[PDB]
Ligand binder design. Structure first.
Ligand code: HEM
Ligand code: HEM
Lengths: 366, 362
């Protein structure tokens, strides 16, 4: 999809995972406030109909104006005149959802609670959530409009628990395109899974019927981690230290000793605690992740410095065999000196909306 | 890759085309040493020359001595200049330092308290500001991040605000952007093409009484939160009554097209456009150059969003103050001013030997 165009909303999988990574992110986690299973199903269907309009660049409901003068417009209007901008909307269900609506026995085993990791300082207010909507678009206003209108449609049935805006991507599903840099100045996304690698996506990303939870076939599992960066500490590190931390050089992003970004890492030349060496599939029994995160900055830290961070998003076939073993291996990561995980959540991302009659979560509910 | 010339009689970023993104930072000065601060302005000017041309600051982001921290933090490598402009301004509190008290312009007036103000001290004020605008937010953020790093030990960041306007890769150029209330925003503004109106309403002139400010301007910044969820429950007629323009076309009530000149008597008496219009304010006219923001959601699940309002004018006492005073009475139901600062924005950097603030510090 070129700039401005729409990303197809229907498919066997939800868009927004293997889709090329859009420039902007608006991630919202919602808690459910209704106990009425029928009312929540009706919300899912109303949300699905809204998403069809939004991802096509159309206003929700009857439109943003022209209705009865005395009624609030159905669409809040601030995306009027804008292109779809590659908007994708990806819904996920958190483990806490399954304490409601009789869903207990339907919780996927792959939707594992994450253990505590060393160094965690998780803010419980910006963690968890019954469900999430990841809105990705090339235009921040398009992404905000989608989240705001979904929240407004859901009034009385869901409330926003927390949200995170990402001002630029730090990830790549398109190795044919330039790899974006994170706020530490390193390319981020070189060795990820590409949207064209159908076999790798089947192996590492999509849930299969044989994995034990039939309603999740074709979905995925999402781990979100809000990671603060100690940029004061990083920025006084020498160039050699920074490159040692990762195992790739800063300018080209090539593995140490090699000349080109996409040359294969030779792990034994990296320091034993180098990030790439510790996170590489070959260090983790083959565990492989689809990374899809974004940078953020939320003002200052009150101590005279810019706040900076990375909103880490990983998709995987099974949280127990993707993020958990890799993150456990990062216990000795040289990068730990410069980061702190401050928020966390996991979600089961259901399969795609197959056609115009289908709806988000229809295989769970149905 | 489009770039905006850094040098000029005026700083860029004021009359030059409005870029898609904003990173605004207010800094406090932590040194008492005038010479050290002047040294900093020169290094900052050298860095700004590099940044606005799309080059790394100093010796670069890599390829130097391995034992040294790189001069540039590296996260804009591979990106375009993205029309980056960097505009510096000096707050009233700066003039209590360095012996400058008698050089504060009278046009750099303290703002009165206005009805409904709910100003957060931590997001207000500041000894100086850097307005970084660019089409790529990572270019803007990189600029602020590196200027702050270069200044470490002499300045700290007091507060910062990210914002967005239109996305120009997808949105036509003669299309007015919409603010987060869904209304076109910017129809009746001073355009950068209007040289005469800029001279009359925006640029400080030497006759105004502060010679070092000639060719500069005065900036008012207001962080204005919108009560989004309340606004979204209002009727379309209520929303249009608040502004005096229709929501779809943005035409003044009773007219057909967005750029039809308004008939103020057809608007309700406390409609925003009627109260803000120059005809209601003795001719007072502003250059608005603000950006929307959405910082997330507050503790009650509400959208922390609004307008980071920026107004440039020849004299704060005859620009923002009389217009904001006249807004004392229908948009106020839906907004709250929660941060404020004023800055004297000096004249432009004339050439490669000149530096930010040279007319003030000599
Ligand atoms: C602020 C936090 C982080 C930063 C700045 C960061 C940065 C990087 C960089 C610069 C690379 C090399 C380029 C690339 O292949 O993408 C990389 C690779 C990688 N990272 Fe991270 N990372 C962070 C967090 C994490 C976390 C939390 C995980 C997993 C739990 C992770 C897993 C990986 C993986 C799997 C790779 C690819 C390794 C390979 O196969 O070669 N990263 N990261
Ligand atoms: C969140 C806050 C605000 C919003 C959403 C808002 C919105 C608007 C809109 C929709 C218009 C009509 C279209 C246009 O000509 O731009 C307008 C006009 C205008 N506004 Fe505001 N505004 C806000 C705050 C302010 C403030 C604080 C001031 C000055 C103190 C101001 C001064 C003006 C002026 C001078 C005009 C042009 C009036 C004319 O000459 O026709 N606005 N604004």
């Amino acid at each position: 999809a070129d700039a401005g165009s729409a990303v197809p909303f229907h498919g066997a999988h939800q868009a927004g995972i293997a889709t090329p990574v859009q420039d902007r992110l608006h991630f919202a986690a919602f808690d459910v406030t209704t106990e009425d299973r029928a009312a929540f199903v009706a919300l899912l269907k109303e949300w699905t109909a809204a998403a069809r309009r939004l991802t096509a660049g159309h206003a929700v409901g009857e439109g943003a104006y022209g209705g009865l003068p005395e009624a609030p417009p159905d669409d809040t209007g601030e995306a009027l005149g804008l292109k779809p901008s590659r908007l994708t909307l990806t819904i996920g269900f958190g483990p806490s959802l399954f304490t409601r609506f009789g869903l207990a026995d339907l919780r996927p085993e792959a939707l594992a609670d994450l253990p505590k990791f060393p160094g965690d300082n998780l803010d419980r207010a910006r963690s968890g959530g019954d469900l999430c909507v990841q809105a990705c678009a090339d235009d921040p206003q398009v992404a905000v409009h989608a989240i705001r209108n979904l929240a407004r449609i859901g009034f009385g049935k869901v409330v926003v628990r927390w949200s995170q805006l990402g001002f630029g991507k730090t990830s790549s599903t398109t190795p044919d395109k330039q790899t974006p840099r994170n706020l530490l100045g390193f390319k981020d996304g070189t060795r990820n899974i590409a949207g064209t690698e159908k076999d790798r996506l089947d192996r590492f990303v999509w849930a299969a019927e044989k994995d034990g939870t039939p309603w999740m076939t074709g979905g995925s599992y999402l781990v979100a981690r809000r990671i603060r960066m100690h940029i004061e500490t990083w920025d006084r590190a020498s160039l050699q230290e920074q490159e040692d931390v990762f195992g790739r050089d800063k300018g080209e992003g090539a593995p140490v000793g090699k000349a080109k970004e996409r040359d294969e890492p030779f792990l034994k030349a990296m320091k034993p605690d180098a990030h790439v060496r510790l996170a590489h599939p070959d260090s983790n029994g083959g565990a492989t992740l689809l990374r899809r995160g974004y940078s953020f900055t939320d003002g200052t830290d009150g101590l005279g410095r810019l706040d900076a961070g990375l909103f880490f998003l990983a998709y995987q076939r099974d949280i127990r065999t993707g993020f958990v073993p890799v993150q456990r291996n990062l216990a000795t990561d040289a990068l730990n000196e410069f980061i702190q995980h401050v928020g966390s959540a996991v979600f089961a991302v259901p399969p795609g909306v197959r056609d115009a009659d289908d709806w988000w979560g229809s295989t769970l509910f149905g």
